Amino acid sequence: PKYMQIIDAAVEVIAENGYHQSQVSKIAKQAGVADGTIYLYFKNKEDILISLFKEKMGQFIERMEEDIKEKATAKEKLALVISKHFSLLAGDHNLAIVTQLELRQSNLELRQKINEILKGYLNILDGILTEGIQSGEIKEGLDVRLARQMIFGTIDETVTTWVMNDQKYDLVALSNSVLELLVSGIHN
Amino acid sequence: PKYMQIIDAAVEVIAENGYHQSQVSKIAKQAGVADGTIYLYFKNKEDILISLFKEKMGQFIERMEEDIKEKATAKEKLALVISKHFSLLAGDHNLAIVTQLELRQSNLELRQKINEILKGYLNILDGILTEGIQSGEIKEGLDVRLARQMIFGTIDETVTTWVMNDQKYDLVALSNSVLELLVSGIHNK
Ligand SMILES: CCCCCCCCCCCC(=O)SCCNC(=O)CCNC(=O)[C@H](O)C(C)(C)COP(=O)(O)OP(=O)(O)OC[C@H]1O[C@@H](n2cnc3c(N)ncnc32)[C@H](O)[C@@H]1OP(=O)(O)O
């Protein structure tokens, strides 16, 4: 449908110049749609970015809530999440730039809307950590919120450094190393 | 000072209005100087953003080098880095909005310029790790670049989460627990 066609073009255009500079007109042209056609599916520019996050990151999130259920341990569940995330971004240069660089917006309402979608991802982390503690796999006394900030911050900084390096090295190849740093930390 | 008066007014205006709505005229008004005096020191709005980051980072790094030579172990140095990072930002509401939100420009030419200023701090993290590696304090097989990304992303996301909650809780008090999470990870035992 034209809805997804438009989201896919928006990823391209938004990645090119940045969300702020991106123009709805450029998005239509790139989608090979008329200008008014865009307004047939989206209210405005912000609705395009929010929906892009909903469709790209939101789908990923839903998929992970399902797929982590088959992994026995907290470590395996986190391994799946990091590996699948790096894989989703490694498959699309534009999507890597957008989902990393447009994640935290200055405008309050736009930020809240994007944060709402990303809460889903944080809920997955908290759940993995909560259950891991009850099974005895995860550190007893662990502050779940803080440990989720370290896991999400680590994943995010790893992907953003790769984006700032033109995505030139194999991100997916790092998933296990990133996992072991989170599981065992830096001490010997 | 004229240069620092402008940088300080820029922090305020950019925090309060968002970088895109922070034009030179607004900064000039905020600093109490004329537009032409802004340009006597800066090229444009972008130059003010980049220079505010370079100036604030530079002070931060000189203090860091000063304090961490006292410390013996890699864990002691990281403890100082975390607590000093959290303290600086808890100490200046508008600067934290600038660092966590306004400096995160997605245009790539500009973002590269900003990111080159981060290199000095990342370099400090890499030296703590490599010193630790030589002294046998750091886990065998640990990759320095990845460990640096973990340390800085964990620190930075802890600050972003606190900014997202309107800086309403005591960030600084979380320093030690953030350190222990980086040092031993989430595994039980
Ligand atoms: C004011 C108060 C202050 C308070 C503290 C500061 C507040 C923060 C300010 C806000 C700004 C942000 O948004 S910071 C939060 C988000 N983070 C970022 O945007 C940082 C993204 N990272 C980067 O842009 C970069 O890492 C730099 C520019 C910072 C430094 O780049 P660098 O010096 O070249 O070093 P590096 O990135 O390691 O790249 C070197 C080589 O290694 C490769 N490489 C890099 N990482 C890896 C890796 N994990 N595994 C394999 N290879 C890797 C690269 O491809 C390149 O290869 P080859 O080319 O040779 O093949």
From Swiss-Prot, chain A:
DNA-binding span(s): 23-42
GO MF, any single term: transcription cis-regulatory region binding
Location of the HTH tetR-type domain: 1-60
UniProt cross-references to Pfam families, sorted A to Z: TetR_C_4 (PF08359), TetR_N (PF00440)
Compartment(s): Cytoplasm
Listed GO biological process terms: fatty acid metabolic process; lipid catabolic process; regulation of DNA-templated transcription
Keyword entries, A-Z: Cytoplasm, DNA-binding, Fatty acid metabolism, Lipid degradation, Lipid metabolism, Repressor, Transcription, Transcription regulation
Coiled-coil region(s): none
Record's GO cellular component terms: cytoplasm
Spans through the membrane: none
Quaternary organization: Homodimer. Binds to DNA.
Function statement: Transcriptional regulator in fatty acid degradation. Represses transcription of genes required for fatty acid transport and beta-oxidation, including acdA, fadA, fadB, fadE, fadF, fadG, fadH, fadM, fadN, lcfA and lcfB. Binding of FadR to DNA is specifically inhibited by long chain fatty acyl-CoA compounds of 14-20 carbon atoms in length.
Identification of the protein by name: Fatty acid metabolism regulator protein
